[PDB]
Amino acid sequence: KLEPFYVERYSWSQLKKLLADTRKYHGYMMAKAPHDFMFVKRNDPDGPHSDRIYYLAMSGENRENTLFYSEIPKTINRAAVLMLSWKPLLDLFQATLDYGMYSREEELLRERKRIGTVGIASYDYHQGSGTFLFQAGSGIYHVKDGGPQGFTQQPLRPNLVETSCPNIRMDPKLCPADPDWIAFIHSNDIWISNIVTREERRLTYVHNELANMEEDARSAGVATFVLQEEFDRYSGYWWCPKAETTPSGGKILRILYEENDESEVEIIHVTSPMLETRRADSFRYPKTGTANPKVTFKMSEIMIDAEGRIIDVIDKELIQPFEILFEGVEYIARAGWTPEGKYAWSILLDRSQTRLQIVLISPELFIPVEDDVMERQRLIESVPDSVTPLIIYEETTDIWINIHDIFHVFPQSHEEEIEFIFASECKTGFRHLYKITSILKESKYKRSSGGLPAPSDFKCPIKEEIAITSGEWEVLGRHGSNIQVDEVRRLVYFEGTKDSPLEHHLYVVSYVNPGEVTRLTDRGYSHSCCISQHCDFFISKYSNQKNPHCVSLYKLSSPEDDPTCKTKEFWATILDSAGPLPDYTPPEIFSFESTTGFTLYGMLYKPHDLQPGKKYPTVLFIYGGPQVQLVNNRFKGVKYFRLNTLASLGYVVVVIDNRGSCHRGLKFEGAFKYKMGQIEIDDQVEGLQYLASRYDFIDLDRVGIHGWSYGGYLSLMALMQRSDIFRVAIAGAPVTLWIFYDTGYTERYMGHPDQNEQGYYLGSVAMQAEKFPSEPNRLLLLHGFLDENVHFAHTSILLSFLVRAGKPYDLQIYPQERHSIRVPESGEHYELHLLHYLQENLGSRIAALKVI
Amino acid sequence: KLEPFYVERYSWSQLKKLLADTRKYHGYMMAKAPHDFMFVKRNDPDGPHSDRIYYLAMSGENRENTLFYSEIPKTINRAAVLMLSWKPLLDLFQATLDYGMYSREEELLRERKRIGTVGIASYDYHQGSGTFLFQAGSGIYHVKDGGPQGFTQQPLRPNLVETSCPNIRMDPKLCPADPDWIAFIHSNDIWISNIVTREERRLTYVHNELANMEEDARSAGVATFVLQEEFDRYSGYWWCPKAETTPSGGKILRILYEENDESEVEIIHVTSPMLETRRADSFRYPKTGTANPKVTFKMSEIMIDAEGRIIDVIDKELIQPFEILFEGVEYIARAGWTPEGKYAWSILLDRSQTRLQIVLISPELFIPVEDDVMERQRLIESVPDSVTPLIIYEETTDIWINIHDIFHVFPQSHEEEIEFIFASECKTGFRHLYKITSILKESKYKRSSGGLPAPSDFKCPIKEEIAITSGEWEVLGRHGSNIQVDEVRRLVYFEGTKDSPLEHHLYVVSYVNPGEVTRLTDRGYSHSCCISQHCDFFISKYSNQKNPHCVSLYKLSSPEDDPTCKTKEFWATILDSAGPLPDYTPPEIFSFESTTGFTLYGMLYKPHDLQPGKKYPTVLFIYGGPQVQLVNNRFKGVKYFRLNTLASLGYVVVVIDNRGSCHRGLKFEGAFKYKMGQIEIDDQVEGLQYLASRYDFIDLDRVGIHGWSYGGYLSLMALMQRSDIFRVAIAGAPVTLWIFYDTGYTERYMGHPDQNEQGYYLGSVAMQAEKFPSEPNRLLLLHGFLDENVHFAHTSILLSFLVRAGKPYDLQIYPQERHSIRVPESGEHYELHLLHYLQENLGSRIAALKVI
Numbered sequence A, B: 001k002l003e004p005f006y007v008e009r010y011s012w013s014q015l016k017k018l019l020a021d022t023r024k025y026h027g028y029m030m031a032k033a034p035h036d037f038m039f040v041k042r043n044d045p046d047g048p049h050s051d052r053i054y055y056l057a058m059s060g061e062n063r064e065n066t067l068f069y070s071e072i073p074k075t076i077n078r079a080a081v082l083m084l085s086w087k088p089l090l091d092l093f094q095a096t097l098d099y100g101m102y103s104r105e106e107e108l109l110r111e112r113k114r115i116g117t118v119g120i121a122s123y124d125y126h127q128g129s130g131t132f133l134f135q136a137g138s139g140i141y142h143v144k145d146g147g148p149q150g151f152t153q154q155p156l157r158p159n160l161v162e163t164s165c166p167n168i169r170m171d172p173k174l175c176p177a178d179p180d181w182i183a184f185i186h187s188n189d190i191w192i193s194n195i196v197t198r199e200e201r202r203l204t205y206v207h208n209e210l211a212n213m214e215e216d217a218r219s220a221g222v223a224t225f226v227l228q229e230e231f232d233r234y235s236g237y238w239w240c241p242k243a244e245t246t247p248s249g250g251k252i253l254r255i256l257y258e259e260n261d262e263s264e265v266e267i268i269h270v271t272s273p274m275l276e277t278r279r280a281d282s283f284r285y286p287k288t289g290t291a292n293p294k295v296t297f298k299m300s301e302i303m304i305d306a307e308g309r310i311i312d313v314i315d316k317e318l319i320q321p322f323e324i325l326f327e328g329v330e331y332i333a334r335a336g337w338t339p340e341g342k343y344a345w346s347i348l349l350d351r352s353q354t355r356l357q358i359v360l361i362s363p364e365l366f367i368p369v370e371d372d373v374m375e376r377q378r379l380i381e382s383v384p385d386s387v388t389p390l391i392i393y394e395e396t397t398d399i400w401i402n403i404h405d406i407f408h409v410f411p412q413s414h415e416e417e418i419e420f421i422f423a424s425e426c427k428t429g430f431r432h433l434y435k436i437t438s439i440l441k442e443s444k445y446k447r448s449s450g451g452l453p454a455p456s457d458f459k460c461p462i463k464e465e466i467a468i469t470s471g472e473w474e475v476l477g478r479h480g481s482n483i484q485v486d487e488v489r490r491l492v493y494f495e496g497t498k499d500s501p502l503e504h505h506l507y508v509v510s511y512v513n514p515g516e517v518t519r520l521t522d523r524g525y526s527h528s529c530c531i532s533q534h535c536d537f538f539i540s541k542y543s544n545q546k547n548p549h550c551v552s553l554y555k556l557s558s559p560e561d562d563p564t565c566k567t568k569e570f571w572a573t574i575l576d577s578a579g580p581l582p583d584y585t586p587p588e589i590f591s592f593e594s595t596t597g598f599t600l601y602g603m604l605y606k607p608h609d610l611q612p613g614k615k616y617p618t619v620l621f622i623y624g625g626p627q628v629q630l631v632n633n634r635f636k637g638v639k640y641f642r643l644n645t646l647a648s649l650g651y652v653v654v655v656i657d658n659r660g661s662c663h664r665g666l667k668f669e670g671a672f673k674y675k676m677g678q679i680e681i682d683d684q685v686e687g688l689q690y691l692a693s694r695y696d697f698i699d700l701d702r703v704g705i706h707g708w709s710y711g712g713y714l715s716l717m718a719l720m721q722r723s724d725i726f727r728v729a730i731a732g733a734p735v736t737l738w739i740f741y742d743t744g745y746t747e748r749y750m751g752h753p754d755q756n757e758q759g760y761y762l763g764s765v766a767m768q769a770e771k772f773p774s775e776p777n778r779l780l781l782l783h784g785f786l787d788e789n790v791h792f793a794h795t796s797i798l799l800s801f802l803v804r805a806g807k808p809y810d811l812q813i814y815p816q817e818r819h820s821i822r823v824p825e826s827g828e829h830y831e832l833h834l835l836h837y838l839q840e841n842l843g844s845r846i847a848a849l850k851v852i
């Protein structure tokens, strides 16, 4: 047997220094890498550059995220490496746009989007005009570059869209049909504004700001909480991309929009950030098994004259109710328009999130809003029976639909036929690309006859459904991953896991005659990529376990003999890594064949200065919930630097991707359907025991577990289920009662509470307080006091029952925090307390000495 | 030098047992001793009993508080000791009135009154009729005993006052003029009800229950938060004690009432008890320096016919506004009527609470409410100019007015003269009794002339002001202590501190020719007493440090030669102590001459089995705020049993009454005016050092401090000011920012925030987070999560700043608790955690071992 290693026992002040010192040189890495790329052709045969790329980035730390451009040359010196100069697009020389001073609406949107970046978070572009449009702080701004106006050689003054609106304007979008017009949201209604004429018009009259929210529960053009939190949809209006000309010389613009009524959604109260007020803000929060918002589509029809003045605005609604036309639909997951504007589209889910359908909605299906019951019938009867919704695709699953951003509609060959690419895990269990052609036939349902439509009545038959990709690996379509379709060469570029579940790579394949899938990115790195709209360059942001993130540009060509075959050449560097981080030792990726049938992957951080014949305390860092993969071949020295710190003090650090994790397919993900909390710890312990039999340095008598969010949830489950294995559990922002979490997440993974009584019971820590230990110095709870996603009541109710059960707990609250750490001092305190708790209760000599 | 004693290091489970075991036999002592006595004469010359006494009590543990009676015999066997039988007044044989299931209104009233007793909390009696009236749970009940109807020999069925009111009825009171009528409060309005006819009528229409409280801020007949919390006034309506006869054969009844408007009072949100709702209740909470409620007096005039039917109700208001008539008055502290009903009285304070005035208010000063501006003038002009308020007494102080319940009005000899007894600390600095005669002259102010009255215009001159008592000791007049006036013998009975600041005693003295103050209670015990209305018996609830509370009845007589001289004879026991509690060692009272000029008193609990040549860890239990005295000659083995437990484990336990404490006079109490937090710890440390020089067993390297409420406040101040002395601080429900505490308390002791910027700063822990220690295991915060008095934000804001400052803390929340512990499991957990924290961080070997 082996001697236990005890960590050096630092004071709280000493640990504060140690932590500060190791973060000092490491301050550069808090800075957004170049993103939101767009390529624009120069079309200058005499000039040296083929393209100008535009992107968002920070030049350094303590500096705002802004628009830059770089110049792509026609030719390169292949002896050398081209570093592209970042030229700032905007005049920011003694001129800041975003300070950190956010409205409530911005604060919340930042939580929902998970963005911590100051400045421009995104932008719109209109290629015909060269018009950029972006929100930055209070203001909405525009500049022109890359259109007929030409290419600037110097930074541009951002032009403020002026306003009479009193409150923050949100979600600005350029009209693709007319770039003089923008729309935005203000106090939950849609407005438009002309950036030349300065004319500004409110389109929807659904919310009064002066009313208190308990009465005034309607909104237009904006996505409600669950859409933002659980479906990554932040906008609820979409411009029609074409204008109908009028005989007068004018035009008609159209905005499709979601109108929401939250009246029957339950109201909770979250503590207001201004703690001194001793008040609480109301939120509409659909808890599991309760009402989601009443939703419908509406359409705004905007008549413009010959010289851009608004003649009239006509608010239109669906000819029959949403619930009749789209039987069984609970959520509008996505929406848009077809490229030529003939039809609006939407991707629609049922409440259980096991049925997806894609529906085309003609504008002819909307009529003017008319309270007058006589002229309303005239309007209804005038719309022909042949005009119905068209369900172009419908799919089901025993597990769940994962919503993604892949959907590409080709130009129409024929009036009665639509051709598109979609992705799905429902055929094979892995997300793949399918080219689908649907027939747009007149429905058997005729409104005139005065009945309601039967469920199948709007289903379009499928002419062809060809699989473009296939295999035991997924195409990526969520969280920034998407496709790029080259309609000339008839190819589709996409990101996937074909080569490895630990690396994302860029692939290309024919959509017309699909076969060999060609990998474009180099093995040994994981890549996040985007492809020029012209399909002749791509950019890869890439790293691996040993090497920090770089961003490089690659040129695409094909050989003379085969235009389908695509090849790559390095062109230039956009961002270099500046070596490997000093005093960072990366982990080793390991794997083990589980008794569950699956290979499971993990990361092991060995203790630094590992003495032979000693056994070391062990810390299991965990997330283990859906939509996340911790273990992959990416640089972990930025986001997970403190795992390396733990290792440096003498902790073994372990991370395992249990079943339920991302990037292993739907069957793998599906392992915990109805069963959250019941399976994940078995995987964690199995991985832990694999390591322990292989490596005698792991002291199994001193294992700790720590996680945030689903990680905190599981940290509690570890302690409750397996007190024999886990000595301490440090749970951050856990769910302790699934009945208090929301509809969109909870019902997806656990179903309705009445149809899973035991799953809800067993998955709910707070129902099981008696199962916690009766020894102190094992349970530490952490929570953001202002958290509106995971309410603090998860913790307060757990404590309520721990107190009744006579069980000890330790507790830390971060009173300025929600479901995130945004105040640096909060993070500093957390890290310090964590290291101190581990030292005193797991790792040190004194920890061992106090265990009776 | 001496060897340190280390406490035995128990596990959490072992400590849970130890604590449970020591509380098992000790369960009897959670039971209300007999109180709310009333003596009624039998007037039966042939019978064996002179009186029947009625009182409230519990027969045992886990049983409701109810009405009992006992029989006082004409004669006793003086060889023996008479134990009076407790005969239950009510039929409760298979019949419970109060369960623990309270409305919000009851929950809050119980917090304000500080009552933890289930059942009848109080009762009314009408001596003419024998009618008892009392609320118990939902219901209002009545029974008859002791009037013309006679004396029951068996328990009575309580008769429910029936109702059509939907919601809890509160604050029932019998009309003294007509015991067929009661009044009560329902949804913040005054109602009356006839208990014979069953007629029920709403009198005020000031609150709509269907409205939400942010709009609907008015109330009638009820005391607002600050009155209840800070002035011990729970009712806001008072029946006129006489009926005016009408020529029809009917009568007029009158209720004076306070009408409140809380519209401009700030609204806070407290977490709702039903934690699962994830909601928060609105409270009107006047924080320091902000608006108190707009108050006025109103009067309800109720015309009854010959056979008890209401003819009409006329709501009347003051002829001129309250703010004009009572210039400078902020608070209505007390109100009532003169014994014959000619005048309403009120005791009125200014905002600074340094000016008291007593004012008589004629009913002629109220006119009908009339919106119509013509008939309103007719009504105003009809009231003669000579009718004004009469300020019969006015007093000021550099320190503060302490409100008390002493005020006795004699019957009028003469129309233009009023004679009364009041108490005051303003003349001498100690509360004494004064007989005052004031002249009721017509005021120089005449309304007709159309001006506003000058401040002095309603002041009555003082004919005589004779001091009845005097000296360096106080008469008691708050929290149950009052006087009893014998108008025949011309004597006044009162409780006081004349013999000792550590013992309360009963005294008697002449009010007409005052001199020798005669003590009636025996030395060596502290007494709480009440005197028969007939002034020939009293009852004393008495204890001392060695002996639990007893209740005995004493007969009063005077010798033949001198009816002024009063003497006492033991008659009977009501409650016996049942010996001394086993395994309880009481503390020794000590004292020391402070460098501040004052003698300070303390209690020392020596460690049990005190080994010679060892030094022991020391725990300072503290309150140290105003209105409380911890150190006196009373039995501490019930409320402070865990101090004895600490002593049994090996802690030295110390309690000191620093300056600011009760029962030492106003100068003593005044020491911290403007200076709360600055002086109390100096006294505590001085007492601690007195003990340490005298007793070598006190280890000054291991001192802890613990308190609740003001005690928790001071525990934080100890750690912040004196980290050299106090190793650990366990602070329960502290104020950390005086700006968040209320008007009535905070401004009394600390003035307005603008006029005491430094005092507020220095007294506010949360402004001084940088002054806390940078070592962990020293600060433990405890708080009731639902606390509406000391909001949880005191703790959450402190933590906010501790986190920014990088300072460690420990935290425990009691999620089912307010500013009290009412759920037994919460108390169990608290006691357990406390002992464990002290063991691990102060007292044990492991505590000493972890101090680097």
Ligand SMILES: N[C@H](C(=O)N1Cc2ccccc2C1)[C@H]1CC[C@H](N2CCCC2)CC1
Residues within 6 Å of the ligand: A094, A095, A160
């Ligand atoms: N920082 C401001 C700015 O740059 N603004 C540009 C701008 C664009 C659109 C809408 C508003 C604004 C204001 C102004 C710069 C000049 C400054 N003076 C006072 C101190 C010395 C100089 C006043 C503020």
Ligand SMILES: N[C@H](C(=O)N1Cc2ccccc2C1)[C@H]1CC[C@H](N2CCCC2)CC1
Residues within 6 Å of the ligand: A091, A095, A096, A097, A098, A137, A138, A139, A157, A158, A159, A160
């Ligand atoms: N943050 C902006 C800024 O500082 N700018 C500097 C600057 C320099 C060159 C070109 C454009 C700009 C914009 C503006 C500050 C004033 C603000 N108002 C909103 C209502 C009250 C104040 C609108 C935006």
Ligand SMILES: N[C@H](C(=O)N1Cc2ccccc2C1)[C@H]1CC[C@H](N2CCCC2)CC1
Residues within 6 Å of the ligand: A229, A230, A479, A625, A626, A627, A628, A709, A710, A711, A713, A733, A734, A735, A745, A789, A790, A819
């Ligand atoms: N709504 C979820 C959430 O915030 N949860 C809090 C929480 C706490 C305990 C137990 C379960 C949960 C769920 C989040 C949805 C987005 C997802 N992102 C990960 C990488 C891309 C997508 C993370 C989870």
Ligand SMILES: N[C@H](C(=O)N1Cc2ccccc2C1)[C@H]1CC[C@H](N2CCCC2)CC1
Residues within 6 Å of the ligand: A757
């Ligand atoms: N009586 C059961 C129980 O108490 N159980 C304890 C227990 C412990 C471990 C494993 C299984 C069990 C079952 C369950 C109570 C809820 C009930 N629902 C049906 C209608 C609505 C409520 C279903 C059964």
Ligand SMILES: N[C@H](C(=O)N1Cc2ccccc2C1)[C@H]1CC[C@H](N2CCCC2)CC1
Residues within 6 Å of the ligand: A757, A758, A761, A767, A768, A801
């Ligand atoms: N008796 C219930 C149970 O054991 N269930 C098991 C079970 C299994 C399948 C389906 C439903 C169920 C419910 C729960 C036990 C914990 C209890 N708390 C409230 C007071 C403190 C503890 C809530 C009820």
Ligand SMILES: N[C@H](C(=O)N1Cc2ccccc2C1)[C@H]1CC[C@H](N2CCCC2)CC1
Residues within 6 Å of the ligand: A621, A639, A640, A641, A642, A643, A708, A709, A732, A733, A784, A818, A819, A820, A821, A827
């Ligand atoms: N960036 C994350 C963060 O700071 N979070 C705070 C927070 C608050 C509420 C809900 C979720 C979250 C996640 C952290 C990533 C690294 C991890 N380290 C701890 C010691 C080892 C590595 C902690 C989480």
Ligand SMILES: N[C@H](C(=O)N1Cc2ccccc2C1)[C@H]1CC[C@H](N2CCCC2)CC1
Residues within 6 Å of the ligand: A701, A702, A727, A841, A842, A843, A847, A848, A849, A851, A852
């Ligand atoms: N498996 C544990 C162990 O060996 N540990 C080593 C160690 C070192 C540092 C911090 C924690 C730990 C836990 C032991 C389990 C039984 C326990 N008994 C004490 C009272 C009765 C039960 C003692 C600990």
Ligand SMILES: N[C@H](C(=O)N1Cc2ccccc2C1)[C@H]1CC[C@H](N2CCCC2)CC1
Residues within 6 Å of the ligand: B094, B095, B160
């Ligand atoms: N406990 C109740 C009571 O004593 N009441 C007296 C009383 C007085 C005023 C207003 C309401 C009431 C109800 C009733 C006793 C008889 C009981 N039966 C059903 C189970 C077997 C017997 C029903 C309840």
Ligand SMILES: N[C@H](C(=O)N1Cc2ccccc2C1)[C@H]1CC[C@H](N2CCCC2)CC1
Residues within 6 Å of the ligand: B091, B095, B096, B097, B098, B137, B138, B139, B157, B158, B159, B160
């Ligand atoms: N707590 C009371 C009781 O139990 N009593 C027993 C009892 C026995 C003899 C004489 C009087 C009494 C009163 C009554 C229970 C029913 C309650 N209602 C209010 C609205 C809904 C229910 C009114 C009071």
Ligand SMILES: N[C@H](C(=O)N1Cc2ccccc2C1)[C@H]1CC[C@H](N2CCCC2)CC1
Residues within 6 Å of the ligand: B229, B230, B479, B625, B626, B627, B628, B709, B710, B711, B713, B733, B734, B735, B745, B789, B790, B819
């Ligand atoms: N309103 C006060 C309160 O609750 N406070 C909470 C608290 C916490 C920290 C610092 C100061 C304070 C004041 C209480 C008023 C009544 C008083 N009683 C004691 C025995 C009879 C009268 C106790 C104090």
Ligand SMILES: N[C@H](C(=O)N1Cc2ccccc2C1)[C@H]1CC[C@H](N2CCCC2)CC1
Residues within 6 Å of the ligand: B757
């Ligand atoms: N400038 C002073 C300060 O900052 N001080 C720090 C400090 C520290 C220890 C001891 C004394 C002091 C004084 C105070 C700031 C508030 C100010 N008020 C007057 C008008 C409203 C605000 C009065 C002075």
Ligand SMILES: N[C@H](C(=O)N1Cc2ccccc2C1)[C@H]1CC[C@H](N2CCCC2)CC1
Residues within 6 Å of the ligand: B757, B758, B761, B767, B768, B801
């Ligand atoms: N600078 C102020 C001060 O020192 N004062 C002393 C002083 C003396 C007499 C009268 C007024 C005053 C105010 C306070 C220091 C603590 C600070 N907190 C906010 C951020 C965290 C810390 C609030 C202001």
Ligand SMILES: N[C@H](C(=O)N1Cc2ccccc2C1)[C@H]1CC[C@H](N2CCCC2)CC1
Residues within 6 Å of the ligand: B621, B639, B640, B641, B642, B643, B708, B709, B732, B733, B784, B818, B819, B820, B821, B827
């Ligand atoms: N009856 C009091 C109580 O339980 N309180 C709870 C509580 C909660 C909020 C605000 C004030 C209070 C007071 C306790 C009296 C005895 C004391 N013991 C602790 C160990 C030594 C003796 C503790 C206080």
Ligand SMILES: N[C@H](C(=O)N1Cc2ccccc2C1)[C@H]1CC[C@H](N2CCCC2)CC1
Residues within 6 Å of the ligand: B701, B702, B727, B841, B842, B843, B847, B848, B849, B851, B852
């Ligand atoms: N006066 C303290 C003492 O002697 N204690 C005995 C003891 C035993 C049990 C629990 C607490 C205590 C405190 C010592 C003060 C200085 C401190 N240094 C360590 C790092 C630098 C400063 C050590 C403790």
